[PDB]
Amino acid sequence: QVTVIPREQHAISRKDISENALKVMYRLNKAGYEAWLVGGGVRDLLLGKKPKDFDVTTNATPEQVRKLFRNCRLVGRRFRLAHVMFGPEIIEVATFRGNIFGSIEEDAQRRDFTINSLYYSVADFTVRDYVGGMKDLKDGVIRLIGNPETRYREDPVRMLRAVRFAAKLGMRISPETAEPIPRLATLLNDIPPAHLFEESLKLLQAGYGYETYKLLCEYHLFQPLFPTITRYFTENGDSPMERIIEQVLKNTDTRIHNDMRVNPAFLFAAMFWYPLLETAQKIAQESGLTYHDAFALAMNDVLDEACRSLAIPKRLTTLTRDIWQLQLRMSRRQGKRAWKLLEHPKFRAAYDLLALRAEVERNAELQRLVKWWGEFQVSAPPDQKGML
Amino acid sequence: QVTVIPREQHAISRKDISENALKVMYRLNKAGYEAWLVGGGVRDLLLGKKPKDFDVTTNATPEQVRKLFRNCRLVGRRFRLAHVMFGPEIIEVATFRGNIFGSIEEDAQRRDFTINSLYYSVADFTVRDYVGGMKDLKDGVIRLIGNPETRYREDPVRMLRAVRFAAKLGMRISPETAEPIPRLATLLNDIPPAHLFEESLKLLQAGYGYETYKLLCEYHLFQPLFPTITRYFTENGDSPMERIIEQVLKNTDTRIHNDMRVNPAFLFAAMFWYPLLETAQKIAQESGLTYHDAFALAMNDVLDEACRSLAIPKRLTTLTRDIWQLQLRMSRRQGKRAWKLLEHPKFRAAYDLLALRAEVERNAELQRLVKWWGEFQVSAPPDQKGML
Ligand SMILES: Nc1ncnc2c1ncn2[C@@H]1O[C@H](COP(=O)(O)OP(=O)(O)OP(=O)(O)O)[C@@H](O)[C@H]1O
Ligand SMILES: Nc1ncnc2c1ncn2[C@@H]1O[C@H](COP(=O)(O)OP(=O)(O)OP(=O)(O)O)[C@@H](O)[C@H]1O
Ligand SMILES: [Mg+2]
Ligand SMILES: [Mg+2]
Fold first, then answer.
1. B119 FRET partner, CA 20 to 30 A, in A9, A152, B207, B382?
2. Ligand 2, CB within 6 Å, residue ranges
3. How far apart are CA A249 and CA A271, in angstroms?
4. How many Å from the N-terminal Cα to the C-terminal Cα in chain A?
5. B353 and B327 in contact (C-beta within 8 Å)?
6. Contacting residues for A193 by C-beta, under 8 A, at least 6 apart
């Protein structure tokens, strides 16, 4: 066991790569308090990679952190957890937990995985490893802290994170930490649909999506969240839907790394697409009615029972509804309303759906619609007229 | 002589084709006042075309009008000139004029042209013509009301309007009303650049642009407004900049007849492009700077001067500058920095300008950055990945 690591044996974790939350600790260290830098970035820093967050912890009570910062711009409460604002840098200052407020060692144990529970002191350039941490981090092991069996039951979402980190970094899950998941997965439905929604995005809409999907399928974690989707999987391995999902992911992923923004209302409208389509079939031949009105029903239901697991905000769903709406409208080769359409705020997305539907189905008559809209949108108004 | 023309013999401008701003005349009529429809609409109505606006006039004091609508959603200010709201519909309710105000006849006179001073009462289905009005409308004639000479001097913009209706509707300008213009044209430099901007857009940005520039040039009214451009015309008639101003207008026009949002900041960057391309090259040699630094000065220069004539909003100038800047970046066959660009809020307009530049210069070098950016902008991140 090795509880304190020195700056000379610890990957340099050079004081200078820490931005200036250093101003936030220095203030504490000066006041007779303790300043530690915990979790995310402190992991990354040891890895060599650039921190995305910088969060800190202290033996200073929350009302004590209030006085020592009353002059600062402290953004919004929470319990414990204080929020300092620079601007485009916000720094989280949280008090150690234990009866309620305790020691550094105490705080370490209530944290989830090993590597995400390493601590840095600007004051002594030492990192504290009350857990496997350092080794896990070297060996590339996502390990949980207490008794997996119990933790996952206390907070089931702890399971989701295990995969998420597993995918993000090149790491594998500890056996003990992995055993329980497939069995305990179902536990996710005792989770408020909203919290889920957050984590669904943390997983896919985070630029790892594809590797995190493989991992969510290999642990039966995908099913609880997207019932409406698992059901249309096939033995064969790659149905139109089973490809599209891999693609919209792989791509949303490329986007996020070339730093482009991304539409979640898209991501979803893509996956559920085929399911919607399938419900259009049954809705039509059965309960025989028009294919427009039929489609429109499939929407409400598919979105209903999907919104039954993930809590999608009314905002998103409504763009989604539009992305699908456009799929029918575009299909009907026609004239003057193409300006009306080209203008639509969700066209860009809607074109990128048609993009995929044509790539996956390899339906040459679709890609055909894809070249046309392709040119009719980069073309200039004299040509755009002639195209009709 | 023939001052009152009845529902049957007058193009039946039919009570049915008046938006329910009838409900506002009705209150007026019921209340002992009379209330008439004027100009904009009544003109189009007699021409058959759908009005774009309905403005009522009454012999009620602006005071009497204020009171008889208290219950209503009446939007504020403006001597005389009262305003009432519904939905997307606003109804303009101004009082006659003539100490200050008076007879329906006394009002017919302070109005700029003969057509735009026809009057309609729903209460008797007659239209009152106290000017050439009816005949002129039949004939296709824009004819200022009193003495052109004096009036233009009273309000020089009356000249611009005159030329605008001339191109919008399909009709010719009255001899008596055309003579004074080429002479008196300069008078516009006395007018606050504010009004000129306003009216500059009613001329080119209402989708009559091309025809309204065939006139603005053929009556030397163009010059007072756009000094910076006038200067660069070539007797040839076929310079790149001259072709560009044609096309951009022809196109802005198309955009408007197909209900597509149009951008003002684009319009301008398009015209002044070549005057900007010129002032840059002259700043390049005359003073041995780098081109990138040279260009940027030229931007300031062209703007200040145009700003000297048209009060162009600090808003639109920013966008413009950017649309231009983008033209430097889209030039370099850029690497992974292109994702950032694709994202720019203006990229569509910057593209649309590379579009024209390539078409008018009839340059193949440019015509390639067009074909390229056309694909790189509709492709998928897989494909797009590769292109780079
Ligand atoms: N419900 C919970 N139970 C126990 N510990 C928790 C819980 N929620 C958060 N934590 C702790 O918070 C820390 C994670 O912080 P945060 O949520 O900002 O993500 P992170 O570790 O920075 O993730 P990333 O590696 O993606 O940056 C972990 O060390 C974890 O132990
Ligand atoms: N400064 C002015 N001097 C004299 N008359 C004016 C003045 N400003 C406006 N008018 C009168 O207002 C009427 C025009 O109304 P408005 O400004 O709504 O345009 P419009 O005639 O409806 O144009 P359009 O044909 O484009 O619809 C004209 O009949 C004109 O005589
Ligand atoms: Mg946290
Ligand atoms: Mg008006």
1. B207
2. B 39-40, 52-53, 55, 110-112, 116-117, 155, 165
3. 9
4. 75
5. yes
6. A307, A308, A309, A310, A311
Looking only at the bridges linking them, the beta strands covering A141-142 and A126-128 are unpaired
- The one-character DSSP state at B222 is H
List, in order, residues 6 or more apart from A71 with CB less than 8 Å away.
Answer: none
Distance A46 CA to ligand 1 centre (A): 17
For the question of residue B53 being annotated catalytic, the response is yes
Phi first, then psi, for residue A91 (nearest 5°) are -115, 125
Q: Are B306 and B228 in contact (CB under 8 A)?
A: yes
Beta bridge partners of A58: A95
B124 shares its domain with B225: no
Pair B135, B146 in one domain: no
Chain pair A-B, CB pairs under 8 angstroms: 53
The phi and psi torsions of A22 (rounded to 5 degrees) equal -60, -30
Q: Which domain holds residue B286?
A: 141-388
Q: Which of B86, B108, B140 is the last residue of a domain?
A: B140
Indicate if ligand 1 lies below 6 Å from the C-beta of A278: no
Chain B residues inside the 8 Å CB shell of A375 = 374
Longest dimension (CA), chain A: 76
Q: Are residues B164 and B126 in the same domain?
A: no
Query: Looking at the structure, do residues B349 and B359 belong to the same domain, yes or no?
Result: yes
How far is the C-alpha of A280 from the C-alpha of A289, rounded, in Å?
10
Is B107 a catalytic site residue? no
Residue A298 CA to residue A296 CA, distance in Å, equals 6
> Which of these is catalytic: B44, B55, B107, B136?
B55
Q: What is the Cα–Cα distance from A311 to A315, expressed in whole angstroms?
A: 11
Residues A320 and A202 in one domain: yes
Method used to determine the 3D structure: X-ray
**In terms of Cα–Cα distance, which of A173, A237, A160 is closest to A203?**
A160
CATH number, domain with residue B147: 1.10.3090.10
CA–CA gap between residue A323 and residue A257 (Å, rounded): 24
Are B8 and B76 contained in the same domain?
yes
CA distance B97 to B57: 10
Determine the Cα–Cα distance for residues B41 and A363; give it in Å rounded to an integer: 52
- Residue A74 main-chain phi, psi, to 5 deg: -95, 110
Domain of B69, CATH number, reads 3.30.460.10
Which residue in B159, B158, B155, B270 sits closest to B205, CA to CA? B270
B39-62 burial: b if 16+ Cβ within 10 Å, else e: bbbbbbbbeeeebeebbbbbbbeb
Ligand 1 atom 26: residue of nearest CA: A40
Residues A79, A214, single domain; the answer is no
* Declared resolution, Å: 3.3
Of B140, B173, B189, the residue that ends a domain is B140
Q: Are B130 and B95 in contact (CB under 8 A)?
A: no
Residues of B in contact with A251 (CB under 8 A): 380-382
How many domains are contained in chain B? Answer: 2
> Are A132 and A38 a contacting pair, CB within 8 Å?
no
Pocket lining: A202 vs ligand 1, CB cutoff 6 Å: no
B247, containing H or E segment: helix B240-257
In angstroms, rounded to a whole number, what is the distance separating the alpha carbons of residues B351 and B52?
32
Separation CA B347–CA B341 (nearest Å): 7
Rg of chain B on CA atoms, in Å: 25
For helices B193-204 and B158-168, the axis angle rounded to 10 degrees is: 10
The helix (H) or strand (E) run that includes residue A177 is helix A175-178
For residue A92, the cross-strand partners are: A55, A83
Residue found by looking up tokens 């981090």 in the block: A137
d(CA A227, CA B233): 68
Cα torsion B350, B354, B355, B360: sign: positive
Compute and round to an integer the Cα radius of gyration of chain A. Answer: 25
For residues B77 and B105, state if they share a domain.
Answer: yes
